[PDB]
PDB file of C-alpha atoms in Angstrom:
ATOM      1  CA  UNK A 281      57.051  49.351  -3.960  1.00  0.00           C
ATOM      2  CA  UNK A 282      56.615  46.163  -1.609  1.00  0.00           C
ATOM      3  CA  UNK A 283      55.983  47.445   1.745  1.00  0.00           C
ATOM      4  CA  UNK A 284      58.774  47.970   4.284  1.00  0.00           C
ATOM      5  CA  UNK A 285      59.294  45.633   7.244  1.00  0.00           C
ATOM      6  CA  UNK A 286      60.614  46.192  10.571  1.00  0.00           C
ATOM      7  CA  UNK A 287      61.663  43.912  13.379  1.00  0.00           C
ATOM      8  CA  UNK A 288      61.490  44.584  17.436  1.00  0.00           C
ATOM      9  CA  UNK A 289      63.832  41.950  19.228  1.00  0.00           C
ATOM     10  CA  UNK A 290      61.808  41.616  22.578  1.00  0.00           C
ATOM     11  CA  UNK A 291      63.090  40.480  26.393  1.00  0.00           C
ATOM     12  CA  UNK A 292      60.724  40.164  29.484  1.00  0.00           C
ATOM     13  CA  UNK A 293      62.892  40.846  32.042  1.00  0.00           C
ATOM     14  CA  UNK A 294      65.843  40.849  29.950  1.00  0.00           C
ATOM     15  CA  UNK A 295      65.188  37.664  28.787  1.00  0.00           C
ATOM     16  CA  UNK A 296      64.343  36.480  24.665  1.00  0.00           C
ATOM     17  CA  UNK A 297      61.161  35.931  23.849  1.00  0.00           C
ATOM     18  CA  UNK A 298      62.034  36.299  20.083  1.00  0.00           C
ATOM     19  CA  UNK A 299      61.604  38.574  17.237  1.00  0.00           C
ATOM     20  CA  UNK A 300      58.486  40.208  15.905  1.00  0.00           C
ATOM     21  CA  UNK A 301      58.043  41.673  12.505  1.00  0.00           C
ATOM     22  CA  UNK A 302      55.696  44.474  11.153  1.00  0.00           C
ATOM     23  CA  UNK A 303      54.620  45.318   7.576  1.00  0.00           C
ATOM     24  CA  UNK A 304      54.008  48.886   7.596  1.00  0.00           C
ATOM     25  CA  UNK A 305      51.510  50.109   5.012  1.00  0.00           C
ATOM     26  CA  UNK A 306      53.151  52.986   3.342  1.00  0.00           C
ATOM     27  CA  UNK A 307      51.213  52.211  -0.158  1.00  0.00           C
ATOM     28  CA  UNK A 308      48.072  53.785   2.252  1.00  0.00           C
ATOM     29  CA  UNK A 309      49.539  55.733   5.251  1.00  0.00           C
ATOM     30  CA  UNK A 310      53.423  57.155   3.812  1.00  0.00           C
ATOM     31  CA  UNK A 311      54.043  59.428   6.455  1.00  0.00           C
ATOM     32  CA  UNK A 312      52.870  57.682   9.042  1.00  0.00           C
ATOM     33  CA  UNK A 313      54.879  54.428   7.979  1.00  0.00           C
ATOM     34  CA  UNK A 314      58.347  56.523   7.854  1.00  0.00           C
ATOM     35  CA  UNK A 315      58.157  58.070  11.072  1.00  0.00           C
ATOM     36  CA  UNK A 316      57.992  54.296  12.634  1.00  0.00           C
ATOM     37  CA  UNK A 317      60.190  52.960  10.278  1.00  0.00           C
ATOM     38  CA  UNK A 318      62.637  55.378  11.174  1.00  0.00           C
ATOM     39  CA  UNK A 319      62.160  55.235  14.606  1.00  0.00           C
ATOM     40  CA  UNK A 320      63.129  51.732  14.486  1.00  0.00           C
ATOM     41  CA  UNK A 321      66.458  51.563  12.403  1.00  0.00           C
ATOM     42  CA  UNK A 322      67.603  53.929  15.157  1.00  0.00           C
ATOM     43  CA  UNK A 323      68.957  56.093  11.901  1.00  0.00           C
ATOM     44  CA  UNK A 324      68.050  59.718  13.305  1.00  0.00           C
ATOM     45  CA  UNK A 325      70.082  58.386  16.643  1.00  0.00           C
ATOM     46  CA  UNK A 326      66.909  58.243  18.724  1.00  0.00           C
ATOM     47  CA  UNK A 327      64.250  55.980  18.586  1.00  0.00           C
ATOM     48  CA  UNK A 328      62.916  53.013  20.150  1.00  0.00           C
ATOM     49  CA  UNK A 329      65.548  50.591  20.588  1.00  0.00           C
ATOM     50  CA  UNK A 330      65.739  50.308  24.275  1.00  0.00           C
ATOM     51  CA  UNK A 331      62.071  51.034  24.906  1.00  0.00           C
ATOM     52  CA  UNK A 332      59.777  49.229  26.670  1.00  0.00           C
ATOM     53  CA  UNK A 333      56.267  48.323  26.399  1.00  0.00           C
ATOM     54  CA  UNK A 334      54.264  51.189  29.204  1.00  0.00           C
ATOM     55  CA  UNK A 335      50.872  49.700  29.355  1.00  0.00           C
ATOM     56  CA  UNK A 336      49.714  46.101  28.639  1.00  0.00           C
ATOM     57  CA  UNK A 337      45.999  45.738  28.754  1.00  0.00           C
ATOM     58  CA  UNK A 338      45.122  41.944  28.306  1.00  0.00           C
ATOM     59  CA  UNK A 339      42.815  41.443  25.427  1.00  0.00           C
ATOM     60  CA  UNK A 340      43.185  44.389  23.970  1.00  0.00           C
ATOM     61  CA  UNK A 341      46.264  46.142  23.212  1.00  0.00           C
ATOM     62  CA  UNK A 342      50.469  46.569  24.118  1.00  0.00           C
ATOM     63  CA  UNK A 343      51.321  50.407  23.844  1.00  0.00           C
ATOM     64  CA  UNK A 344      54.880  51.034  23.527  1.00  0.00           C
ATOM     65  CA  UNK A 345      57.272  54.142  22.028  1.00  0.00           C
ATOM     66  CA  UNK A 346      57.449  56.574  24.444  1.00  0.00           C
ATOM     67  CA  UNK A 347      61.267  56.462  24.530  1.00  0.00           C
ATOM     68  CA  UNK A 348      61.794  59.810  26.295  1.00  0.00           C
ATOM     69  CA  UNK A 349      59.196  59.332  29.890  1.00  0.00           C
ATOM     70  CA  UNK A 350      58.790  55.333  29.692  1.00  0.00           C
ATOM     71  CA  UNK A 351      55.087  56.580  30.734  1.00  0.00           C
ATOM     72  CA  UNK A 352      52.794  57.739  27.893  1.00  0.00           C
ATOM     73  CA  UNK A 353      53.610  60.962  28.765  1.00  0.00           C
ATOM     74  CA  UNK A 354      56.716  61.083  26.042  1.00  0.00           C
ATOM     75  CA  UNK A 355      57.890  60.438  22.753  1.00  0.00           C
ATOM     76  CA  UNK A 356      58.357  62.571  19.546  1.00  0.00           C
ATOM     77  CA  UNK A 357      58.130  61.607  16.047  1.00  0.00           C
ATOM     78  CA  UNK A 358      60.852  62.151  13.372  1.00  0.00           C
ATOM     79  CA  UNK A 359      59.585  65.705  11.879  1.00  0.00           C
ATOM     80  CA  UNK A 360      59.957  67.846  14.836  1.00  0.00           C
ATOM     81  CA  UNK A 361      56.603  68.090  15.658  1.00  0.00           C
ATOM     82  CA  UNK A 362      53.643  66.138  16.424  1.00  0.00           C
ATOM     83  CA  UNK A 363      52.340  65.427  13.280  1.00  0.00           C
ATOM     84  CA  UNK A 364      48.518  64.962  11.309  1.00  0.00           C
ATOM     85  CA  UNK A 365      46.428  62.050  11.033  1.00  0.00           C
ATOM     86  CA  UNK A 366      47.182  61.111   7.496  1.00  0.00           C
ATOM     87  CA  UNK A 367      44.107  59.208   6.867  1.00  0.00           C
ATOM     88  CA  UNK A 368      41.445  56.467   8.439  1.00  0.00           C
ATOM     89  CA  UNK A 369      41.727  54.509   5.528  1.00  0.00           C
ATOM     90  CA  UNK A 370      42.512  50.984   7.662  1.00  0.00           C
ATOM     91  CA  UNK A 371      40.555  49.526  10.413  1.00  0.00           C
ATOM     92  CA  UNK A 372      41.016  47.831  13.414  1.00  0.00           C
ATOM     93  CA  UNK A 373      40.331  44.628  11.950  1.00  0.00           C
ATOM     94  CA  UNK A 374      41.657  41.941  14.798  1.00  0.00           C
ATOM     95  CA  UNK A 375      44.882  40.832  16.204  1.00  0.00           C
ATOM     96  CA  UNK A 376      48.214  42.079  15.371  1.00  0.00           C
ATOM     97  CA  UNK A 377      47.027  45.582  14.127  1.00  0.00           C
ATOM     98  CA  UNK A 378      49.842  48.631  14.590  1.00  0.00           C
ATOM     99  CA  UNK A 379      47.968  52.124  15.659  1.00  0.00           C
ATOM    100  CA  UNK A 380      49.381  55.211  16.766  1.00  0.00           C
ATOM    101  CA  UNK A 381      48.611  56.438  19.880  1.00  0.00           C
ATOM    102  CA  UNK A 382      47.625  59.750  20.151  1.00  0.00           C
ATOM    103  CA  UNK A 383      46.243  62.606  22.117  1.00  0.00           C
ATOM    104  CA  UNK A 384      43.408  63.797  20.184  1.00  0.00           C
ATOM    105  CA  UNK A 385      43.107  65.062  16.173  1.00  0.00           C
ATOM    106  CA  UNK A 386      46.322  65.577  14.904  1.00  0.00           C
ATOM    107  CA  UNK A 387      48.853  65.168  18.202  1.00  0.00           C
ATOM    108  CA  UNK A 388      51.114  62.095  16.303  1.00  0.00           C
ATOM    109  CA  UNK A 389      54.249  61.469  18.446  1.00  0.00           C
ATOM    110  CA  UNK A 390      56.081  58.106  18.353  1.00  0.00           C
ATOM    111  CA  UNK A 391      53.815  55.758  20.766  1.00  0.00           C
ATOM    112  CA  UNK A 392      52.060  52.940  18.863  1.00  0.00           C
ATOM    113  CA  UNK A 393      49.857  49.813  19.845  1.00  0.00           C
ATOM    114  CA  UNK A 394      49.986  46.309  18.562  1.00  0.00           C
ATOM    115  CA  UNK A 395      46.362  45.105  19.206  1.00  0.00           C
ATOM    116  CA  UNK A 396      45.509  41.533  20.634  1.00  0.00           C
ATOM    117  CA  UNK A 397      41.647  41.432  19.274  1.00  0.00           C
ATOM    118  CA  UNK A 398      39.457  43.554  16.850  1.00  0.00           C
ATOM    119  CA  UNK A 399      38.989  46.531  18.545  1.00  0.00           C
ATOM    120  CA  UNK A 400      36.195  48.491  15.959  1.00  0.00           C
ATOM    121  CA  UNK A 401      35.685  51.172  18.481  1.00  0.00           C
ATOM    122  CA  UNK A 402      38.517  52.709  17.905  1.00  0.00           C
ATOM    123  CA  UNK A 403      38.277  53.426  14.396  1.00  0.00           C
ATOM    124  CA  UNK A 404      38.316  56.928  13.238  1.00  0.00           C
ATOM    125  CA  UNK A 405      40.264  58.001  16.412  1.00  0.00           C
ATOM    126  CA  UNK A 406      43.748  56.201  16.018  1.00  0.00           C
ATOM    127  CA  UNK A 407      46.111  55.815  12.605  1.00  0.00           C
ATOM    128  CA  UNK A 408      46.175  52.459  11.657  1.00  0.00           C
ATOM    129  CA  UNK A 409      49.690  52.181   9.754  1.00  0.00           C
ATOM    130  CA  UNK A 410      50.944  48.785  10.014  1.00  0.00           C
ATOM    131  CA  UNK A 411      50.156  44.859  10.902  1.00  0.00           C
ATOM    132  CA  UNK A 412      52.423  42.010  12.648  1.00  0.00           C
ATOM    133  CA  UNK A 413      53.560  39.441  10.382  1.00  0.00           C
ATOM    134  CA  UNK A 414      55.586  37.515  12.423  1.00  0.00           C
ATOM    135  CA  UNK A 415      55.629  36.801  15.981  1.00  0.00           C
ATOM    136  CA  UNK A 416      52.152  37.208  16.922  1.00  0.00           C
ATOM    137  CA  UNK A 417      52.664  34.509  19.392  1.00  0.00           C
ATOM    138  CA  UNK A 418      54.948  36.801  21.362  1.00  0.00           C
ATOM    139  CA  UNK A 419      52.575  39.557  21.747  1.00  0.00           C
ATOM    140  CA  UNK A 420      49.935  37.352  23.097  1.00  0.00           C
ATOM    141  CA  UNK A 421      52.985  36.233  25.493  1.00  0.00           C
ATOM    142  CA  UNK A 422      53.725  40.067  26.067  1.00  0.00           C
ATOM    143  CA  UNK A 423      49.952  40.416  26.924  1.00  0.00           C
ATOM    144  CA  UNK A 424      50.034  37.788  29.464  1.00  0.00           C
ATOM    145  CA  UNK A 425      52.452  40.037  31.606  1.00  0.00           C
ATOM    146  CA  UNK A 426      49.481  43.021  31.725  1.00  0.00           C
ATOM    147  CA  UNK A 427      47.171  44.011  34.045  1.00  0.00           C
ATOM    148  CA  UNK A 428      43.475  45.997  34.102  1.00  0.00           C
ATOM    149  CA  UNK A 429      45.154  49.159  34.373  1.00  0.00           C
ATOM    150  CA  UNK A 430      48.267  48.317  31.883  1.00  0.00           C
ATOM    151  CA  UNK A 431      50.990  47.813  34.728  1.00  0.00           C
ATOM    152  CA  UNK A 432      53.329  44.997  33.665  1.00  0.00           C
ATOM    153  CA  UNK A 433      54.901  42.166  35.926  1.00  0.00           C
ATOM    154  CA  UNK A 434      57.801  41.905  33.916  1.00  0.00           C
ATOM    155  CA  UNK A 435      59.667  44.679  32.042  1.00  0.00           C
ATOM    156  CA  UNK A 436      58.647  44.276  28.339  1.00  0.00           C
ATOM    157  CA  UNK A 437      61.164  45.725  26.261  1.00  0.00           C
ATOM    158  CA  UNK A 438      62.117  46.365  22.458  1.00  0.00           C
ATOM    159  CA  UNK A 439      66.007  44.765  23.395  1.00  0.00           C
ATOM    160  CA  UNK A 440      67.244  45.537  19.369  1.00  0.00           C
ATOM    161  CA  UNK A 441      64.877  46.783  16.240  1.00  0.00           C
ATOM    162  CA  UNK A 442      65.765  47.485  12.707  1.00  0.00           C
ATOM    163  CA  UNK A 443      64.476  47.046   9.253  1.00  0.00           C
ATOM    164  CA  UNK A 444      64.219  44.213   7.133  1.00  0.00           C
ATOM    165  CA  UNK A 445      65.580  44.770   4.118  1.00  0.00           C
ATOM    166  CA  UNK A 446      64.279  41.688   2.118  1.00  0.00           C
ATOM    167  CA  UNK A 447      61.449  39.877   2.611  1.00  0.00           C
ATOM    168  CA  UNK A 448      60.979  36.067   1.331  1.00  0.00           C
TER     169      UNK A 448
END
């Protein structure tokens, strides 16, 4: 099967800054891929549509999902518990890289991070299930609105997201 593709519709301060897209790798990572997809279509009536981006950190990362605290302290994935790290299989290989966040071996939820830049030490330790395809100029523009300790000047936030059904 082609992988799956999902779109976030983003606003800073409630305004468009467009639409980014995601391949999510479920020939490698399946389980990890259909709790995200999921969690975007909105199809279990929770998810992340709504949701803002938590913590920006300028040249590294925008972490996002936690759609139940809006703090990294929330979240829940779609099989009623956190769930396993399916496999390290993909690496943090550069810009535009989706990783779950995490709280240790095995503690999946429903946060996530888009990456900005390699970032190789984090291999091993974080799920890497899926990659931006388009719209990587809008996360560098969402990373612009960090900070050193991941507070944002504008509200970042995932304004519509869904699945793409086709993909030319």
């Amino acid at each position: 099967m082609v992988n799956p593709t999902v779109f976030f519709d983003i606003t800073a301060d409630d305004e468009p800054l467009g639409r980014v897209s995601f391949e999510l790798f479920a020939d490698k990572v399946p389980k990890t891929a259909e709790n995200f997809r999921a969690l975007s279509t909105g199809e279990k009536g929770f998810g992340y549509k709504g949701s803002s981006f938590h913590r920006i950190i300028p040249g590294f990362m925008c972490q996002g999902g936690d759609f139940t605290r809006h703090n990294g302290t929330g979240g829940r994935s779609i099989y009623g518990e956190k769930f396993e790290d399916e496999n390290f299989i993909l690496k943090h290989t550069g810009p535009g890289i989706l990783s779950m966040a995490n709280a240790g071996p095995n503690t999946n939820g429903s946060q996530f991070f888009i990456c900005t830049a390699k970032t190789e030490w984090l291999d091993g330790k974080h799920v890497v299930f899926g990659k931006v395809k388009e719209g990587m100029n809008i996360v560098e523009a969402m990373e612009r609105f960090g900070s050193r300790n991941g507070k944002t000047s504008k509200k970042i936030t995932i304004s519509d997201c869904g699945q793409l059904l086709e993909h030319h």
